[PDB]
Amino acid sequence: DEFMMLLSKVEKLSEEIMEIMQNLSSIQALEGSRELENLIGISCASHFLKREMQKTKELMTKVNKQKLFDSYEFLKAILN
Amino acid sequence: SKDLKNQLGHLESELSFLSTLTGINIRNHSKQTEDLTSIRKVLQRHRLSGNCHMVTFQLEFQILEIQNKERLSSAVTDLNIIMEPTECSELSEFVSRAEERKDLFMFFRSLHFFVEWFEYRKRTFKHLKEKYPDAVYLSEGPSSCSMGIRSASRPGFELVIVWRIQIDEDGKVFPKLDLLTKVPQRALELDKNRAIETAPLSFRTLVGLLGIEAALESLIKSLC
Amino acid sequence: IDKMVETTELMTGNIQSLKNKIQILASEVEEEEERVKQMHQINLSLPELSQKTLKAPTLQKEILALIPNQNALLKDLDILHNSSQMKSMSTFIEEAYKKLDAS
Amino acid sequence: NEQEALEEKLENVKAILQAYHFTGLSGKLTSRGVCVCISTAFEGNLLDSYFVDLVIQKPLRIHHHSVPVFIPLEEIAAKYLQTNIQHFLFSLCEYLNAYSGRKYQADRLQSDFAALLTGPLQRNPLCNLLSFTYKLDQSFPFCARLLYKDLTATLPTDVTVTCQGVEVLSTSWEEQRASHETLFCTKPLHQVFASFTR
Amino acid sequence: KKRQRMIEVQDELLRLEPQLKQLQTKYDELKERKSSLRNAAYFLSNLKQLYQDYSDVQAQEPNVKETYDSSSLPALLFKARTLLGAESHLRNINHQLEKLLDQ
Structure with a gap:
């Protein structure tokens, strides 16, 4: 079950990925301007990611426990 | 009791036909009536949930019917709709716009057009995903806006197609296509013809010349 | 008669010329519309897009003129693109997405 | 017994159809085909509704309708009847909604703000061309012409304003006419008139 | 007698006007069609040749430390979108997680 290993390694990776996330203020400086958030599609905001990762853990473990893994013809195909 | 069962079956068939023709499947509907008479004023609150084939919604509004001797004015005093929390920010922007404009029919029609364009985008991306699996790299998935083309010989050279769906202030829905190239400067120093800066405009002219999928497959073949 | 026969004869001469x-x-x-498709194939019914999309402003120039300090951000954008941590993160995300698409 | 449950199902499905009645477009099954009811509303104000009769037999034909004649329905029928009939219905909804909104704006202008208007404003049956002169209370005469080159939108495609009977003598007239032109081009008709009337 | 000449001359003038209009429309759409086709062909050929005559220099040096110009910043930024949205993407799949466990 390599899923445990990948979860552990991403959890250990999280600390330094947020460390390098906060390394530069230019990324934080461009935050809050919708002119780029609408262009990229959603937003530029990663501050509650700790809760996201600590919440996905139980969800993924539960998933593992449960093991979840023309117009004529179109109109005539419905009336039948 | 066979006649009653026959009428129920006929009504169910008609309801299914209307739902699959219009494209809207509604959930349960609730109605409340309040009489505020001073010339008569009635406040009617309606609530209903539903879905369009891909997306669910839950709406609740109230209208004020003013019955007079010669006129019967109906105005949507308040409306409030809720979506599911998807990643489409423009969807929320349009929801806010419709909320502050207090209109209903344009919302339904725009939602229909939006899901229509979304389904064409998804079906087009997924077809090209399987047609040339050795030259396509769908990084985000068929339900996204990005498309990533890359050659397995060299991972350094790859580009992206951005397909966006936009809703104007009036309420219409229109798509847009563009490409972004992640090319190293080694190509710039190799070729002095300088045929990479004009890629966007030329590509948009190309897609307006012989179609969308034709231009995409031509690009795939040229990159092959 | 004079003015309007003059008008119509000039018009029909122009019609013949056109x-x-x-x-x-x-x-x-x-000759060129067959020469174009010599080394390229001649040509899924997707409707043709309107000309408004063709004449709409493109995204690359808007992005370039919208964000300042290109090099000041690139000096770390290249470094992070050369870093392997978010590359492994992206590979994990892609594996999860293809797992979902497999079902 | 089963009668109560059957009646409950009947009333529930009737309520569901009455709910579909409010989405703007409704349909009813008849012997010759389907009868479609189309509704128009502008800014939440419901207006008159129309109906269209269709035939299911191939090829698709039109039996009769009550749409006004000046609405160009023949061409759109010829070019979208046989394919994507729902798109045809949605385009017809666009046309009717725009036309009803334009008529409502014109009627509200005619009825409500009759004091500022001096003479009757020229109007065409399609309501895609307006031309009127107005005096607002000093005296600042203006004449405005609005042309609607599109039929699927309620906003003017081009608006022009001129000062008739008086020469431009101050920048106040220039700024007033520029503001009127911008308001006509962007905001609805009656909204701006109700705005600067106070 | 001349009244009939009036009427008939107006007749041919009127019935020839639309033909002139249609011919003008056809001509001035065909010109731009041909120009656009030629330009697209030129661009496609030039890009194909650039890729073909580059395809070997990358093979000469597989892992050269190659940086990117200001024109590649948008795409790289568009690559960073999910990088700043992955957590939000998780929410979506987290929602799908409930959609998966509604049983």
């Missing part, structure tokens, strides 16, 4: 021009242009365009 007909000859369009005929010669249509005969001339053939």
